[PDB]
């Protein structure tokens, strides 16, 4: 694939629904990032992002800085575990969640692709 | 259709119409591919020019100044999104999140009707 954007959208949506038909081996290197976030912190991060039933991960509400590729990988891991824990529901506004994620991490796509691949 | 989200389905479908990657095919997409009949391949260039799209843009449907009043209009918007996504090429600079923001703001209220009309 040519797009980190397309990969991360697919990965996060798959972490949300856990549908084995939507598995791709492209996801295996992204799943390794789960180590960067404790399952115990996920509910804390959801409450810090003031999330309603209509919200996907809203990372800009964590007020945590993104200065390097390691911060990016933590934000992906947070997105994945939050996506996992909030449930597969039609009202989640994924487009708003991805807007915030890519505004935050876009500039580090080169560093990220090197670090993973 | 055994999924809960029209949003998730349409994001996956449009991204697959963009890259044509057979590993990202899903049979969920077959009913969406039938909507291609609502848009002639001949008009796609015209629609792209009318949406004033740059190399960094996905489909920007709100610039068509076309109405969305019923499920049939929603199906045409999906078809336009699919063929434009097909014709603009798989490029990393395309800002898919901006394109999906516009599509779902336009069609979201018709999601229940759409899921019934397509999948039962």
Domains, chain A, ordered by start: 4-116 (1.10.437.20)
Tokens of B71: 């499920």
**Distance in angstroms (rounded) separating the CA atoms of residues B25 and B4:** 19
Resolution as reported, in Å: 2.2
The answer to whether residue B26 neighbours chain A at the CB level (below 8 Å) is yes
Nearest Cβ partner for B92 among A4, A19, A92: A4
Q: Does B92 touch chain A (CB under 8 A)?
A: yes
Interface touch A88/B6, C-beta < 8 Å: no
A59 close to A12: Cβ distance less than 8 angstroms: no
* Tokens coding A76: 């992906």
Tell me whether A79 touches chain B (CB under 8 Å).
no
Render the burial of A56-93: b for 16+ CB within 10 Å, e for the rest. bbbbeebeeebeebeebbbbbbbbbbbbbebebebebb
Is any Cβ of chain B less than 8 angstroms from the Cβ of A14?
A: no
In whole angstroms, give the CA distance from residue B59 to residue B88.
Answer: 9
Report the 10 Å Cβ neighbour count for B41: 10
Helical H segments across B20-110, by residue range: 30-33, 44-50, 71-88, 96-107
């Amino acid at each position: 694939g040519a797009s980190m954007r397309t990969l991360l959208i697919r990965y996060i949506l798959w972490r949300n629904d856990g549908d084995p038909s939507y598995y791709n081996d492209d996801f295996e290197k992204l799943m390794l990032l789960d180590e960067l976030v404790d399952d115990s912190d996920v509910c804390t991060l959801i409450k810090n992002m003031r999330m309603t039933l209509s919200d996907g991960p809203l990372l800009d509400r964590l007020n945590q800085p993104v200065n390097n590729v390691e911060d990016v990988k933590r934000m992906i891991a947070i997105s994945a575990k939050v996506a996992r824990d909030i449930g597969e529901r039609p009202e989640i506004r994924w487009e708003e969640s991805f807007t915030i994620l890519f505004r935050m991490i876009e500039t580090y796509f080169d560093d990220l692709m090197i670090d993973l691949y």
